[PDB]
Scaffold this motif. Structure first.
Motif, PDB file in Angstrom:
ATOM      1  N   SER A 136      -6.529 113.358 -27.108  1.00  0.00           N
ATOM      2  CA  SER A 136      -4.909 112.735 -26.532  1.00  0.00           C
ATOM      3  C   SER A 136      -5.170 112.508 -24.971  1.00  0.00           C
ATOM      4  O   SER A 136      -6.394 112.693 -24.638  1.00  0.00           O
ATOM      5  CB  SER A 136      -4.160 114.134 -26.437  1.00  0.00           C
ATOM      6  N   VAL A 137      -4.278 111.196 -24.202  1.00  0.00           N
ATOM      7  CA  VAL A 137      -4.338 111.372 -22.964  1.00  0.00           C
ATOM      8  C   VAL A 137      -3.613 112.321 -21.992  1.00  0.00           C
ATOM      9  O   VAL A 137      -2.802 112.614 -21.971  1.00  0.00           O
ATOM     10  CB  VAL A 137      -3.412 109.957 -22.376  1.00  0.00           C
ATOM     11  N   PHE A 138      -4.955 113.045 -21.546  1.00  0.00           N
ATOM     12  CA  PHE A 138      -4.905 114.255 -20.329  1.00  0.00           C
ATOM     13  C   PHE A 138      -5.992 113.663 -19.400  1.00  0.00           C
ATOM     14  O   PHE A 138      -6.953 113.310 -20.055  1.00  0.00           O
ATOM     15  CB  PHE A 138      -4.626 115.281 -20.816  1.00  0.00           C
ATOM     16  N   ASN A 139      -5.636 113.705 -17.791  1.00  0.00           N
ATOM     17  CA  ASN A 139      -6.454 113.611 -17.395  1.00  0.00           C
ATOM     18  C   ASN A 139      -6.730 115.110 -16.785  1.00  0.00           C
ATOM     19  O   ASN A 139      -6.993 115.778 -15.496  1.00  0.00           O
ATOM     20  CB  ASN A 139      -6.089 113.112 -16.335  1.00  0.00           C
ATOM     21  N   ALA A 140      -7.930 116.038 -17.765  1.00  0.00           N
ATOM     22  CA  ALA A 140      -7.552 117.602 -17.719  1.00  0.00           C
ATOM     23  C   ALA A 140      -8.900 117.682 -16.810  1.00  0.00           C
ATOM     24  O   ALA A 140     -10.450 116.749 -17.231  1.00  0.00           O
ATOM     25  CB  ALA A 140      -7.962 117.439 -19.183  1.00  0.00           C
ATOM     26  N   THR A 179     -11.762 127.632 -13.843  1.00  0.00           N
ATOM     27  CA  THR A 179     -12.395 129.027 -14.250  1.00  0.00           C
ATOM     28  C   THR A 179     -11.031 129.430 -14.691  1.00  0.00           C
ATOM     29  O   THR A 179     -10.545 130.133 -13.961  1.00  0.00           O
ATOM     30  CB  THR A 179     -12.830 129.886 -12.943  1.00  0.00           C
ATOM     31  N   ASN A 180     -11.305 129.814 -16.189  1.00  0.00           N
ATOM     32  CA  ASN A 180     -10.213 130.534 -16.991  1.00  0.00           C
ATOM     33  C   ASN A 180      -9.377 129.393 -16.826  1.00  0.00           C
ATOM     34  O   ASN A 180      -8.455 130.500 -17.245  1.00  0.00           O
ATOM     35  CB  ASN A 180     -10.270 131.886 -16.621  1.00  0.00           C
ATOM     36  N   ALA A 181      -9.478 128.260 -17.012  1.00  0.00           N
ATOM     37  CA  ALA A 181      -7.470 128.229 -16.784  1.00  0.00           C
ATOM     38  C   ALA A 181      -8.072 126.113 -16.544  1.00  0.00           C
ATOM     39  O   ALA A 181      -9.316 125.954 -16.489  1.00  0.00           O
ATOM     40  CB  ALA A 181      -7.077 128.648 -15.248  1.00  0.00           C
ATOM     41  N   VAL A 182      -6.690 126.153 -17.389  1.00  0.00           N
ATOM     42  CA  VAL A 182      -7.168 123.964 -17.081  1.00  0.00           C
ATOM     43  C   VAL A 182      -5.898 123.343 -16.029  1.00  0.00           C
ATOM     44  O   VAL A 182      -5.359 123.559 -16.207  1.00  0.00           O
ATOM     45  CB  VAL A 182      -7.128 123.136 -18.427  1.00  0.00           C
ATOM     46  N   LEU A 183      -6.379 122.155 -15.408  1.00  0.00           N
ATOM     47  CA  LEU A 183      -5.571 120.843 -14.489  1.00  0.00           C
ATOM     48  C   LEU A 183      -5.827 120.022 -15.095  1.00  0.00           C
ATOM     49  O   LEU A 183      -7.107 119.399 -15.749  1.00  0.00           O
ATOM     50  CB  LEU A 183      -6.039 121.794 -13.085  1.00  0.00           C
ATOM     51  N   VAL A 184      -4.216 119.528 -15.773  1.00  0.00           N
ATOM     52  CA  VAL A 184      -4.055 117.977 -16.437  1.00  0.00           C
ATOM     53  C   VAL A 184      -2.804 117.681 -15.473  1.00  0.00           C
ATOM     54  O   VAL A 184      -1.460 118.016 -14.946  1.00  0.00           O
ATOM     55  CB  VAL A 184      -3.096 118.361 -17.270  1.00  0.00           C
ATOM     56  N   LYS A 185      -2.891 116.123 -15.355  1.00  0.00           N
ATOM     57  CA  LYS A 185      -1.927 115.309 -14.109  1.00  0.00           C
ATOM     58  C   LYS A 185      -1.335 114.648 -15.307  1.00  0.00           C
ATOM     59  O   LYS A 185      -1.780 114.270 -16.023  1.00  0.00           O
ATOM     60  CB  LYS A 185      -3.047 114.484 -13.774  1.00  0.00           C
ATOM     61  N   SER A 186      -0.302 115.414 -15.224  1.00  0.00           N
ATOM     62  CA  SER A 186       0.891 114.823 -17.041  1.00  0.00           C
ATOM     63  C   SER A 186       1.449 113.614 -16.580  1.00  0.00           C
ATOM     64  O   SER A 186       0.683 112.697 -17.801  1.00  0.00           O
ATOM     65  CB  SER A 186       1.654 115.538 -16.988  1.00  0.00           C
ATOM     66  N   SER A 187       1.709 113.192 -15.359  1.00  0.00           N
ATOM     67  CA  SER A 187       2.062 112.077 -14.919  1.00  0.00           C
ATOM     68  C   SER A 187       2.237 112.007 -13.915  1.00  0.00           C
ATOM     69  O   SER A 187       1.556 112.821 -12.677  1.00  0.00           O
ATOM     70  CB  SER A 187       3.224 112.678 -15.120  1.00  0.00           C
ATOM     71  N   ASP A 188       2.403 110.550 -12.885  1.00  0.00           N
ATOM     72  CA  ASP A 188       2.884 110.415 -12.049  1.00  0.00           C
ATOM     73  C   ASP A 188       3.794 111.404 -11.717  1.00  0.00           C
ATOM     74  O   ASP A 188       4.593 111.494 -11.159  1.00  0.00           O
ATOM     75  CB  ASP A 188       2.880 108.791 -11.577  1.00  0.00           C
ATOM     76  N   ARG A 189       2.724 111.811 -10.167  1.00  0.00           N
ATOM     77  CA  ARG A 189       3.524 112.543  -9.192  1.00  0.00           C
ATOM     78  C   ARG A 189       3.371 114.172  -9.728  1.00  0.00           C
ATOM     79  O   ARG A 189       5.124 114.741  -9.967  1.00  0.00           O
ATOM     80  CB  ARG A 189       5.289 112.215  -8.806  1.00  0.00           C
ATOM     81  N   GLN A 190       3.750 114.007 -10.717  1.00  0.00           N
ATOM     82  CA  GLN A 190       2.927 115.568 -11.492  1.00  0.00           C
ATOM     83  C   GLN A 190       1.992 115.795 -12.215  1.00  0.00           C
ATOM     84  O   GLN A 190       0.927 115.631 -12.235  1.00  0.00           O
ATOM     85  CB  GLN A 190       4.017 115.909 -13.262  1.00  0.00           C
ATOM     86  N   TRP A 191       1.661 117.063 -11.981  1.00  0.00           N
ATOM     87  CA  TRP A 191       0.614 117.937 -12.037  1.00  0.00           C
ATOM     88  C   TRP A 191       0.477 119.285 -13.373  1.00  0.00           C
ATOM     89  O   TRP A 191       2.068 119.911 -12.934  1.00  0.00           O
ATOM     90  CB  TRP A 191      -0.376 118.581 -11.370  1.00  0.00           C
ATOM     91  N   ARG A 192      -0.011 120.096 -14.656  1.00  0.00           N
ATOM     92  CA  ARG A 192       0.394 121.352 -14.902  1.00  0.00           C
ATOM     93  C   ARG A 192      -0.556 122.223 -14.785  1.00  0.00           C
ATOM     94  O   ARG A 192      -2.188 121.459 -15.349  1.00  0.00           O
ATOM     95  CB  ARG A 192       0.896 120.902 -15.618  1.00  0.00           C
TER      96      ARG A 192
END
Lengths: 247, 98, 50, 197
Positions: free
Chosen positions: D104-108, D112-125
Motif C-alpha cells: 500500500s502507498v505509505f511513505n513509511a 525504534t519500536n515504532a513507525v512513522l507514515v506521511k499519510s497525506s500532504d501536511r499530515q504525518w501519523r
C-alpha cells in the motif's frame, strides 16, 4: 427439684436469646437441623446479593470512566496529550474547535475521523529529531501542519454525502465516515452530555448503596447465628423447666 | 433474674445507678426523673424514668438515614452503617493529572 | 461520617444498657418480694388453721 | 465465598474465550458481507498468515485501516456509497490486487519500536509496536491456549475449593448429630466407680 432448679437459669437465658434471634428473622426456628438449613438459605442470599452488587459496581466504574474522558482541559486523551501539545510548538486540534456549534459538530467529527485529537504543528520537520524519544504516547499519534491561530481546513479530498462524508486519504485509499451523534468537537454542549451522565450515575450510586447495605445485613445475620450456636446449643430447644418444677 | 437472691439484684441496681449518674449528668429532665425514682415506696417512678429515656432517644434518632423508632433496634442499623462505610473507605488510586 | 456515627452508637449503646438494667432489676426484685409475701401468708395461714 | 469468587473469574475467562468466536478470535461478519458486495477481499484475510515476528510491525504500519476491503476498481463503491447504512461508522477501502496485493502507498519510515507514515500532504501519523496484531493471526491459537490454560487453572482451583467445602459440611453434620444425641452425657465421669461404691 434441685436438678431442675440448677438447670433452669441457663435454659431461660438461652430461650431469650433464641426468641430474639428468630423474631429478628422472618422464619421461626424449632430444631438444630432447622437452624442449619436456615444457615444454608442465608448463604444463598449472600451469594446472590453480592452478584448484583458487583454488577452494579461494574456499571458505575464504566460511568465514571466515561465521564472522566469528557472532563479536561478540552476532553481528550489528556493523560499525555497536554504535555505532548506543549513539547512541540503546536496546539491541540480539538481545542481549536472548542467553540463549534452543535449543528456542525457531527459533520466535523465525521470529517476529521481518528485525527480529531491530533496536534497542529506548522512545520513537521522540527518534530523529526524529537520523534525517536516518543516512548510515552498514545499508540496512534496524529500531527497536522498549518497556522495554529487561523488554521485553514486541512487539504482533504473530502466529499459530502447524505449523512456521511467520503475522503481520499492517499493514492489507492479512501475513508467513509457516517455522521455520529453527540461528538467530540464542540466542547460546549458536550458538557451538556456529561451533565446527562452525572444524572445517570447518581441513580447507580444510590442503588449500589442499597445493595451494599443489604449484603452487610446478611453477613451480620450469619455472624449472629454463628455467635449464637457457639454460646447456646448446650441447652437449645430443651423442655421448659418452669412447667416441670410447678408439677 | 427470677432465680437470684435479692442481694445480687441490689448490687446490680446500685452499680447501674452509679453508671447512670455519670451518663445523665448533663441533661436536666432525665436527671430530675432519676432523682425522683430512688424512693422505694413509689415503684412506678422508675418505669416513668425509663419512658422518659426512650422518648428522649427517639427524638435524637436522625431518621434521615434511619427509620426504626425503637432505639434498641436502631443499634443494628448503626452497626451496618459502620461496616459499610469502612468498606467504602478502601481505595481508588487512579491518580494522574496536569 | 464514620466519626459521627461512632459517637452516636457509643452514646446510645451505653445509656440504653444502664437504663434497662437499673429499671428491670428493681422490677424483678419487687416481683420476688411479692412472691415471698404470698408464700409467708399461705404458710402461716395453713398452720394457723390446722 | 472463595469458591464463588473463583467461579466468577472462570466465567469471565470463559466469556473472553467465547469472544474469540470465529475462527479463533472474532471477526465481524458484516465486513465479510460488505466485501462480498464489492469486488475485493478483507485486508486482514490477505495478511492473516504473515509471520508473528513481523505482525506487530504491520499492525503499527496500517493503524486504523487494518480492517478494510481491497477493491482494485473503486468504481463500484461510489454509486453504491449513498446506499451504505449498516456499515461500520468508519469504513476503510484500499485499491490493489486481492490475489497479489502490492505494498500500500505509505511513505513509511521505521523507528525504534515504532513507525512513522506521511499519510497525506501536511499530515504525518506516528504509531508504536503493539501486541496481538490484527495481521499474522495464524489463528493466534497460542493466545487461545494461554486463555485455556488460565481457565483450566481457575477450574482446578474451583474444584479443590468445592471439595474442601464438602468436607467441612460433612464435619458440621457429624457435630450436629453428636450434640443432638450424646451432649447430655458428654464429658461426664465413669459411672462404674459410683456403682461399685
Amino acid at each position: 427439684i434441685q436438678s431442675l432448679t440448677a438447670r433452669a437459669p441457663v435454659w431461660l437465658a438461652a430461650q431469650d436469646t433464641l426468641n430474639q434471634l428468630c423474631e429478628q428473622s422472618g422464619e421461626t426456628l424449632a430444631s438444630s437441623n432447622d437452624v442449619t438449613e436456615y444457615m444454608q438459605q442465608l448463604l444463598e442470599r449472600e451469594r446472590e446479593a453480592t452478584v448484583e452488587r458487583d454488577e452494579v459496581a461494574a456499571q458505575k466504574r464504566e460511568l465514571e470512566k466515561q465521564i472522566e474522558r469528557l472532563s479536561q482541559p478540552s476532553g481528550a486523551e489528556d493523560s499525555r496529550m497536554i504535555a505532548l501539545a506543549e513539547r512541540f510548538g503546536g496546539v491541540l486540534l480539538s481545542e481549536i474547535y472548542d467553540d463549534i456549534t452543535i449543528d456542525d459538530a457531527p459533520y466535523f467529527s465525521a470529517l476529521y475521523g481518528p485525527a480529531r485529537h491530533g496536534i497542529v504543528v506548522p512545520d513537521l520537520s522540527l518534530v523529526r529529531p524529537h520523534l525517536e524519544t516518543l516512548e510515552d504516547c498514545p499508540e496512534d499519534l496524529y500531527l497536522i501542519e498549518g497556522d495554529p491561530q487561523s488554521f485553514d481546513d486541512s487539504v482533504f479530498n473530502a466529499e459530502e454525502q447524505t449523512n456521511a462524508v467520503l475522503v481520499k486519504s492517499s493514492d489507492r485509499q479512501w475513508r467513509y465516515s457516517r455522521y455520529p451523534e453527540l461528538p467530540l468537537f464542540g466542547r460546549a454542549a458536550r458538557e451538556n452530555r456529561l451533565e446527562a451522565l452525572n444524572l445517570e450515575r447518581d441513580a447507580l450510586a444510590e442503588r449500589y448503596a442499597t445493595l451494599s447495605f443489604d449484603v452487610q445485613k446478611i453477613q451480620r445475620a450469619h455472624q449472629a447465628f454463628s455467635q449464637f450456636v457457639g454460646k447456646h446449643l448446650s441447652v437449645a430447644f430443651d423442655t421448659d423447666p418452669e412447667a416441670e418444677i410447678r408439677e | 433474674l427470677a432465680y437470684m437472691e435479692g442481694g445480687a439484684l441490689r448490687s446490680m441496681s446500685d452499680k447501674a445507678l452509679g453508671a447512670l449518674r455519670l451518663a445523665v449528668a448533663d441533661n436536666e429532665h432525665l436527671r430530675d426523673a432519676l432523682r425522683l425514682s430512688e424512693d422505694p415506696k413509689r415503684p412506678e417512678r422508675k418505669v416513668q424514668f425509663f419512658i422518659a429515656v426512650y422518648q428522649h432517644l427517639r427524638e435524637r434518632i436522625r431518621q434521615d438515614i434511619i427509620r426504626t423508632d425503637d432505639p434498641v433496634d436502631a443499634i443494628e442499623q448503626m452497626e451496618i452503617e459502620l461496616a459499610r462505610l469502612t468498606e467504602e473507605l478502601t481505595a481508588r488510586e487512579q491518580k494522574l493529572a496536569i | 461520617a464514620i466519626r459521627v456515627t461512632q459517637s452516636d452508637r457509643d452514646l446510645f449503646k451505653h445509656l440504653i444498657t444502664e437504663a434497662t438494667s437499673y429499671v428491670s432489676a428493681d422490677y424483678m426484685r419487687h416481683a420476688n418480694e411479692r412472691r415471698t409475701h404470698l408464700d409467708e401468708a399461705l404458710a402461716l395461714r395453713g398452720e394457723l388453721f390446722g
